[PDB]
């Protein structure tokens, strides 16, 4: 058989460090895992609209067979450009629209969110822990809740504050809102952007963050309390076989912690032995299913009820989650 041409639309540069980064670490796992079978290429810094819409057309148009379109913000002109290339294989990263020939993956990145609230708890001397969030859609909102529901499982008393930048990448606006963050109380950060700035930040403050996606400990030794590290490599490899073989078919992908796609980066050396234990017996109880991010109680910040003690919240709300716990607030706007 002749090669499998794959291609990748990344949203931002392999040089973020993070997301694209992460991504960009699945597809060379790809290439070594397959080798000669497939032929990659990639985009980066694709911007949403019309703009994806084209380079998305142009790589189905030279000949690519499998295209990952990388970012939530890449769902519909990835729709309009499966319609019009029904030989070609579309997987949508982060989606909730299929066809027969457009799947979606995603991880369960919350899990490893929820281990960092756990830390974060142990970790904060304010009792405010901090978000930097892109946009307001299901993947991030998850993210937000799994890291206040962790952090209230080990103090109940925990607040998270949470800052917009209404981007998944902007090194300079990422840095503004950490400072925002900090500055209004919160002392252990955590984000759904893409880059190490709030890290940076957080180490030239004395302050504590997260990884997001891969380790970012290089950038910050003294705040990295650990990353929740993506893992695309073998996602990727699957794909590209299931194309090659003739198994592939339109379906809806989460993986998580048990399936090896969401690690957790070592332990900072400041972390010490009590909060070190909690953390390793959580990411046990992770791994096995023997606690879920969003198993009851939960209610939201109404007081509704949304998960009875004994029962875990539906797949149906994960994936449309639009809802906050109790104790997330907004920053007050610089
Ligand atoms: N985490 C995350 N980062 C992104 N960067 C650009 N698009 C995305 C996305 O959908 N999710």
Redesign the pocket.
């Given at each position: 058989q002749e090669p499998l041409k794959v291609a990748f639309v990344?949203?931002?540069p392999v040089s973020d460090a993070?997301?694209?980064y992460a991504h960009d670490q699945g597809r060379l796992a790809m290439e070594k895992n397959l080798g000669a079978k497939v032929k990659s290429s990639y985009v980066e810094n694709v911007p949403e609209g019309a703009d994806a819409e084209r380079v998305i057309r142009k790589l189905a148009a030279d000949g690519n067979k499998l295209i990952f379109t990388?970012?939530?913000?890449?769902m519909n002109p990835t729709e309009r450009v499966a319609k019009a290339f029904p030989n070609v294989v579309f997987e949508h990263?982060?989606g909730v629209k299929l066809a027969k020939n457009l799947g979606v993956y995603e991880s369960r990145?919350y899990e490893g969110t929820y281990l960092q609230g756990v830390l974060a708890a142990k970790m904060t001397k304010t009792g405010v822990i901090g978000f930097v969030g892109?946009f307001p859609?299901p993947?991030?909102i998850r993210?937000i809740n799994a890291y206040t529901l962790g952090a209230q499982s080990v103090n109940p008393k925990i607040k998270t504050k949470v800052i917009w930048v209404s981007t998944?990448?902007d090194p300079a606006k990422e840095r503004q809102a950490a400072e925002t963050l900090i500055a209004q109380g919160a002392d252990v950060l955590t984000q759904?952007?893409?880059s190490p700035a709030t890290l940076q930040v957080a180490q030239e403050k004395g302050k504590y963050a997260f990884g997001?996606?891969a380790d970012m400990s290089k950038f910050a030794p003294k705040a990295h309390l650990t990353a929740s590290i993506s893992n695309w490599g073998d996602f990727y490899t699957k794909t590209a076989q299931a194309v090659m073989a003739g198994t592939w078919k339109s379906e809806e992908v989460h993986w998580g912690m048990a399936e090896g796609m969401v690690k957790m980066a070592p332990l900072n050396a400041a972390v010490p032995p009590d909060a070190a234990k909690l953390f390793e017996e959580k990411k046990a109880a992770m791994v096995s299913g023997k606690i879920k991010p969003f198993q009851g109680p939960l209610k939201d910040q109404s007081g509704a009820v949304k998960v009875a003690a004994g029962s875990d919240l539906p797949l149906a709300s994960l994936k449309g989650m639009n809802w906050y716990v109790q104790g997330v607030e907004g920053t007050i706007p610089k």
């Open positions: 990344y949203a931002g993070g997301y694209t990388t970012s939530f913000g890449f990263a982060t990145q892109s859609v993947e991030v993210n998944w990448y759904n952007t893409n997001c996606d």
